[model samples]
Target: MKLLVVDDSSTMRRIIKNTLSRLGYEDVLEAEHGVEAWEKLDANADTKVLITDWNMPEMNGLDLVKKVRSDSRFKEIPIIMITAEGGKAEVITALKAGVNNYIVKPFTPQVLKEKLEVVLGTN
Candidate 1:
């Protein structure tokens, strides 16, 4: 499935891209922040998944999730929060904002794969 990964750090984006590639998902679009992320989404309607960081400039993941959830076009797309903000409250906040799943930073590829499967309902 196509995925849109939003983060201000290029390193993190590269890491996610590599991991997803290893997991058989090669079509990933990168965005520096929620603003660019939404633009990418509008440009790429086939995006089936969204993986984003909670902290970013111009627009954070929380706002992005809320916007996506509010919009009819992208409301059904599954969003996973891959962020350093791993506190219980943060997870709850993202869930309430409409994330399908959450993953803490410093994660392994296997962890990301598991979360993907959980969200996608695949093995």
Candidate 2:
């Protein structure tokens, strides 16, 4: 399936890209932040997954999730947030904002893969 990896870090994005490749998800897209994500989403209707960082310039991940959920065209898009915020409140906020799943940072590729499987199911 097609996936979008949104973050401010090229290093993190590269890591995610490599992880996705290893997981057999080849059709991937990258965005530096939520604003760029929105631009890419507007242009690519085929995107099915969004792995995003919570804090970012232009627009944050929670706001982006809310935005996507508000739009009928994108409400069904699956979003998995990647954040350093490990608080329960923050997780609830993201879930309430319509995130499909989440992976707190300082996690391994294994954890990331498991969460993605929970959200998108096995490939």
Candidate 1 lDDT (Cα, 0 to 1): 0.85
> Which prediction has the highest TM-score against the true structure?
2
In model 1, which runs have C-alpha deviations exceeding 4 angstroms?
109-123
Error of 2 at 93 (Å): 0.8
Give one digit per residue, the lDDT tens place, for model 1 in 46-101.
88988899998889999989998998888788888989998999999999999988
Each candidate's TM vs. the true structure? 0.88, 0.91
Model 2 vs. true fold: TM: 0.91
Residue 75 in model 2: lDDT: 75
Candidate 2 lDDT, 13-122, residue by residue in tens: 98788777777788899999899998898888788888899988989989888888887789788888888989999999999999877788877878776766666654
Which whole-number lDDT from 0 to 100 does residue 19 have in model 1? 72
State the lDDT at 30 in candidate 1. Answer: 91
